Design a protein around this ligand. Structure first.
Ligand SMILES: [Ca+2]
Ligand SMILES: [Cl-]
Ligand code: NA
Length: 275
C-alpha cells in the first residue's frame, strides 16, 4: 500500500503517508478531512485510510481511532465504491502518465467521468480537450485506453466488461477527432478565450447542435475575430473542412452532422456572395 503512493511522483510521498497515519491514529481529526488534506483523489485517500487501519491494528492503536477509520472507509465504499475501484485498478497506468499528485488525481477524475459516466462522444471529447488540450492530449488518450484495459483485466472491473469494451472504441474515435481538431491551430495561425483550444471546443459544441443554422457560424466567426470579408470566407472554409473530417460518431447523430455541414456550407457561400 505504501509503495502504491510512489505513483504520485511526490519525493516525500512515503513520509507524508506515515505522517498522515500518525495523525489518523492520534484520533483528534476527522479521518476523511485529514486524508483529503494530505492526498488529492479519493483513491489515494481510501488507500491511506486503509494503510492507517492495518498499521493501527498491528500497532495496537486506540479502538475508537480504529472505529473512526472503519466508518470512514465504509462511508467511502458506499458513496464512491466504483470510483475507488476504478482508481485502484488503474493506478500503475495513471502513475506512468502523471508527474505529480495533482496530475494523478486529475487523470483519475477524467477516467471516472468517462468509465462511470454516460457521456456522449462529444462531451467525452470536450472533457479531454478542457483537461489536456494544450498539453499531451494524445498521450492522455493512450493512457486512458491503457487504463480501460487494466480495469477490464482486474478480477473486479469498476464497471461491466461490455461497457469498458465500448469505451475503448469510443476513445479511439476521440483520438481521431483530437487529431483532426489540431487543424484549428493552423487556421488561427493563418488568420490571427477565443484561441485555438477554444475553437476546438466550439466545433465540438456545434457537432451536437440539432438546431444549427448558418447564423451560428456568423457568430462563431465574430467570436474569433474573422470580421473582414476575406478572413470571414477563409475562417468559414477552414471550419467546414475541420467539421467534415471530424468523425461521424462525435456528432449527436448522422442527421445532425448533415445539418451542421449544410449550414457550414451555406454560411461560407453567404460570405462568398458578399464578395
Ligand atoms: Ca499493547
Ligand atoms: Cl455527412
Ligand atoms: Na500511451
Amino acid at each position: 500500500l505504501a509503495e502504491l503512493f510512489s505513483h504520485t511522483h511526490d519525493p516525500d510521498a512515503q513520509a507524508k503517508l506515515e505522517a498522515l497515519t500518525a495523525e489518523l491514529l492520534r484520533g483528534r481529526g476527522a479521518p476523511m478531512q485529514l486524508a483529503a488534506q494530505a492526498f488529492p483523489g479519493v483513491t489515494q485517500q481510501y488507500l491511506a485510510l486503509q494503510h492507517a487501519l492495518q498499521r493501527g491494528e498491528h500497532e495496537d492503536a486506540a479502538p475508537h481511532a480504529l472505529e473512526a477509520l472503519r466508518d470512514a472507509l465504509a462511508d467511502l465504499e458506499l458513496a464512491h465504491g466504483p470510483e475507488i475501484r476504478a482508481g485502484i485498478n488503474t493506478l500503475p497506468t495513471a502513475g506512468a502518465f502523471a508527474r505529480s499528485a495533482d496530475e494523478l488525481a486529475g487523470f483519475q477524475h477524467a477516467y471516472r467521468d468517462i468509465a462511470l459516466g454516460q457521456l456522449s462522444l462529444a462531451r467525452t471529447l470536450d472533457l479531454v480537450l478542457e483537461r489536456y488540450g494544450n498539453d499531451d492530449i494524445h498521450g492522455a488518450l493512450g493512457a486512458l485506453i491503457q487504463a480501460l484495459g487494466h480495469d477490464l483485466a482486474a478480477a473486479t472491473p469498476s464497471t461491466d466488461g461490455v461497457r469498458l469494451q465500448v469505451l475503448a472504441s469510443d476513445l479511439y474515435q476521440v483520438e481521431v477527432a483530437a487529431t483532426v481538431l489540431e487543424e484549428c491551430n493552423a487556421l488561427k495561425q493563418r488568420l490571427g478565450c477565443a484561441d485555438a483550444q477554444g475553437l476546438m471546443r466550439d466545433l465540438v459544441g456545434i457537432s451536437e447542435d440539432k438546431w444549427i443554422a448558418p447564423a451560428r457560424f456568423e457568430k462563431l466567426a465574430e467570436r474569433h475575430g474573422a470580421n473582414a470579408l476575406s478572413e470571414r470566407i477563409a475562417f468559414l472554409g477552414g471550419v467546414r473542412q475541420i467539421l467534415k473530417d471530424l468523425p461521424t460518431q462525435i456528432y449527436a447523430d448522422m442527421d445532425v452532422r448533415a445539418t451542421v455541414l449544410a449550414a457550414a456550407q451555406d454560411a461560407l457561400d453567404n460570405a462568398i456572395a458578399m464578395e
